[PDB]
Amino acid sequence: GGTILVVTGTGTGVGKTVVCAALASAARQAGIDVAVCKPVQTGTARGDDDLAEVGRLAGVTQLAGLARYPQPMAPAAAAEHAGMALPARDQIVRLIADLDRPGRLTLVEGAGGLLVELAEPGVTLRDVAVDVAAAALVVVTADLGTLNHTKLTLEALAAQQVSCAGLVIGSWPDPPGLVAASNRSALARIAMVRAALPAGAASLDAGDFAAMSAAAFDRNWVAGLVG
Amino acid sequence: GGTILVVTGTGTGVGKTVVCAALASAARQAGIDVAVCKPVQTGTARGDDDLAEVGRLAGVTQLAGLARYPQPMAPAAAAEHAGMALPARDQIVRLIADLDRPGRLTLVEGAGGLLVELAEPGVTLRDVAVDVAAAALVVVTADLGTLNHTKLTLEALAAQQVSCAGLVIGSWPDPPGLVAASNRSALARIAMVRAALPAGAASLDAGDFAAMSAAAFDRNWVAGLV
Ligand SMILES: Nc1ccn([C@@H]2O[C@H](COP(=O)(O)OP(=O)(O)OP(=O)(O)O)[C@@H](O)[C@H]2O)c(=O)n1
Ligand SMILES: C[C@H](N)[C@@H](CCCCCC(=O)O)NC(=O)O
Ligand SMILES: [Mg+2]
């Protein structure tokens, strides 16, 4: 195959989609082929479409979804409110494996934080990660509380021997206050911090977002993701 | 000894202190003796002082603390900014074990979440809870994301064989809303929700607060704690 990364986060609203787009953008400019996959997508009735937003910021054309629920809730609840069911575990794995391909980087963005239920019964993105032998990239905030949430998430990853590919601070304020600056230093002691995306990046146009994306990550780390 | 309960939360700002006070008030109205220990308090320059709130709301007088850092940061950050270490692990565990006595409910309120650093070198409320054989009361919100954060916390609890005494929703909005109504049901699918405290209770005076607290917890559970 190729390389699969699940792109998880310490919670919902932390910047997973923007990180998916930025890493996708940076890997494309390195000549790497990129697919982004969004198996469970809630809140469509509010115009939430994470695949579309990755396409809008990054120009990614290989977008694969699967389940779509109208309400902006946890997938279990959004499905119950629509009269629908959750996908099965193997349905999600199949969607990912069909994208996987030598030389391709396949990013898999979850619904919210790592332990959210994606498929019956209580199947999470952690289980999906184990099935496809993927590593997890954890998107974190710079805000008060991020150290605990990060440690909890990493611990839950190691419970099932899912490797951590590093952290990404989804939104990095300019200028950074005392708490942000301190947290960035402390997060670096817990794991490799791969990038710190500037706040408001979704308002950068194609070229600016691509500029920001290449500068955000270490070139050698991005290139070493896929052989 | 008696019952030691550690009071943790899924994050910062979930209302641990109001839950400590509410649980305290309930237990006293069942005639139980309560102590509250807040080993480390931060944000004191702007007047953060969670033990005073417990005294006012619940009338607890055995109120125990070891360190106060002016900066409103996580304790180890607050310590570094001030130029001083955190307390030692021994101080925390022995202050708590010294509060503990037969007939008493001893609540231990952490800072932030379960894995935040509370003492040198890098010891957490979870370590403390292990050292004193306490179960953990998990304070949660009702907002989008509470499920992930709760499951994460309960998983960390279990990883070190710390028992979970339950969840309390620190703040129940009015009116609930679709997410909060569904979350209250969902949280109950992963652990015993012990109470949901009405939004704004923190601001009550002690008389009304005592009434709220009396009705917020199940009486048999409160009694069954000690
Ligand atoms: N460097 C960043 C990070 C985030 N955002 C904005 O902050 C919000 C949250 O980011 P998002 O990527 O959507 O967070 P997710 O973790 O993907 O939340 P969800 O669970 O809904 O997928 C979005 O409006 C996004 O445009 C931004 O402009 N610049
Ligand atoms: C509606 C949000 N945007 C998100 C769902 C977040 C679920 C949070 C569940 C929880 O942990 O309580 N949907 C999504 O990322 O597709
Ligand atoms: Mg997203």
CATH architecture verdict of chain A: 3-Layer(aba) Sandwich
Number of spatially distinct domains of chain A: 1
Q: How would you sum up the global shape of chain A?
A: globular
**Whole-number radius of gyration of chain A?**
16 Å
- The helix-strand sequence of chain A is EHEHEHHEEEHEHEHEHH
Count of distinct strands of chain A: 9
Distance between the termini of chain A: 11 Å
Order of strands across the widest beta sheet of chain A?
A: 3-2-4-1-7-8-9
Largest interface: pair, residues per side: A-B, 32 and 32 residues
What's the CATH first level of chain A?
Alpha Beta
Share of helical residues of chain A:
40-55%
* CATH topology call of chain A: Rossmann fold
Oligomer: homodimer
Largest sheet of chain A: 7 strands, parallel
List bound small molecules: cytidine-5'-triphosphate, 7-(carboxyamino)-8-amino-nonanoic acid, magnesium ion
Strand content of chain A: 15-25%
Enzyme class (chain B): ligase
Cofactor (chain B): Mg(2+)
GO cellular component, one term (chain B): cytosol
Pathway (chain B): Cofactor biosynthesis; biotin biosynthesis; biotin from 7,8-diaminononanoate: step 1/2
Can you characterise this structure?
- Chain A: Pathway: Cofactor biosynthesis; biotin biosynthesis; biotin from 7,8-diaminononanoate: step 1/2.
- Chain A: It catalyses: (7R,8S)-7,8-diammoniononanoate + CO2 + ATP = (4R,5S)-dethiobiotin + ADP + phosphate + 3 H(+).
- Chain A: Substrate binds at residues 38-42, 145-148.
- Chain A: InterPro entries: DTB_synth_BioD (IPR004472), P-loop_NTPase (IPR027417).
- Chain A: Mg(2+) binds at residues 17, 50, 109.
- The structure is a homodimer.
- With 227 residues, chain A is an alpha/beta fold.
- Chain A has one domain: Rossmann fold, CATH 3.40.50.300.
- The first copy, chain A, contains 9 helices and 9 strands.
- Chain A has helices spanning 16-29, 50-58, 75-82, 89-99, 125-131, 146-159, 178-190, 206-216, 219-223; strands at 3-9, 33-41, 63-68, 104-109, 117-119, 123-124, 135-140, 164-172, 193-198.
- In chain A, the strands form 2 sheets. A 7-stranded parallel β-sheet of chain A has the order 3-2-4-1-7-8-9, with helices on both faces. Chain A has a two-stranded antiparallel ribbon with strand order 5-6.
- In chain A, α1 (16-29) runs parallel beside α2 (50-58) and α1 packs across α8 (206-216).
- Chain A is globular and about 45 Å long.
- The A-B interface holds A 11-13, 71-74, 76-77, 81, 112-117, 144-145, 147-149, 151-153, 155-156, 159, 178-179, 182-183, 186 and B 11-13, 71-74, 76-77, 80-81, 112-116, 144-145, 147-149, 151-153, 155-156, 159, 178-179, 182-183, 186.
- The complex binds cytidine-5'-triphosphate (CTP), 7-(carboxyamino)-8-amino-nonanoic acid (DSD) and magnesium ion.
